[PDB]
Design a protein around this ligand. Structure first.
Ligand SMILES: CC(=O)N[C@H]1[C@H](O[C@H]2[C@@H](O)[C@@H](CO)O[C@H](O[C@@H]3[C@H](O)[C@@H](O)[C@H](O[C@H]4[C@H](O)[C@@H](O)[C@H](O)O[C@@H]4CO)O[C@@H]3CO)[C@@H]2O)O[C@H](CO)[C@H](O)[C@@H]1O
Length: 196
């Protein structure tokens, strides 16, 4: 059997880009913040609870799905580009609308730990793991009005936890499903367009 549960993080953060001109590509840093996660998706055909007497195997993969474009409040498109993905595995690069970053750091790990191996959507748990930052840069359209900007950029980040009854178990949430997961995180990108 295989049980996979996606635990979604949902913090809001700000990044000050300062004064910028439309010929520049201001950057912003997206950091992974340990916190409370909410199940937003699962797929299970195994047992619901492990009572401590039985073994199962863990495969954990961190995910970040980030938009390639975002509209400003006043109606202008900002183009998001990856500047430094750190150790993240940037995949499904052909998608026109979103970046997909994954970090599979645990696999084939046998455990007897008691717990709920298929929490339902809405359930929560605390994620204490830390992952690398991702630095993005933004291209501003030349026709962007001058002034202060506070751009809300929704995105998904979370932990895919896969429990299985056997060794060598592998599962990755399909990109097409991931792209649709609730985007509970928010980067609030601030900057003042002084021209150019
Ligand atoms: C679908 C698939 O399995 N392979 C694709 C691959 O998928 C892996 C990728 O998304 C990474 C990103 O971190 O996470 C998963 O794998 C983890 C580790 O990162 C990876 O190093 C490790 O590999 C070990 C393998 O499992 C062992 O059997 C082997 O003996 O030793 C290897 C190295 O130590 O595996 C884990 C698995 O959880 C994903 O599985 O991504 C690429 C890039 O897109 C491509 O699609 C592959 O087909």
């Amino acid at each position: 059997w295989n049980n996979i549960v996606f635990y979604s993080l949902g913090d809001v953060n700000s990044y000050q880009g300062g004064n910028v001109v439309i010929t520049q590509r201001p950057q912003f840093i997206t950091s992974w913040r340990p916190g409370i996660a909410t199940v937003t998706w699962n797929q299970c055909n195994g047992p619901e609870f492990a009572d401590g007497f039985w073994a199962y195997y863990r495969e954990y993969i961190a995910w970040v799905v980030f938009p390639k474009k975002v509209m400003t409040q006043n109606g202008y498109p900002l183009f998001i580009e990856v500047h430094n993905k750190g150790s993240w595995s940037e995949e499904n690069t052909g998608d026109n609308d979103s970046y997909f970053f994954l970090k599979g750091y645990k696999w084939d790990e046998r455990a007897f730990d008691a717990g709920n191996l298929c929490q339902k959507p809405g359930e929560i748990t605390r994620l204490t793991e830390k992952f690398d930052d991702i630095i993005f840069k933004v291209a501003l359209p030349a026709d962007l009005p001058l002034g202060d900007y506070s751009v809300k950029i929704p995105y998904t980040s979370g932990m895919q936890r896969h429990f299985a009854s056997y060794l060598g178990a592998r599962f990755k949430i399909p990109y097409n499903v991931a792209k649709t997961l609730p985007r509970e995180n928010e980067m609030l990108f601030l900057f003042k367009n002084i021209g150019g």
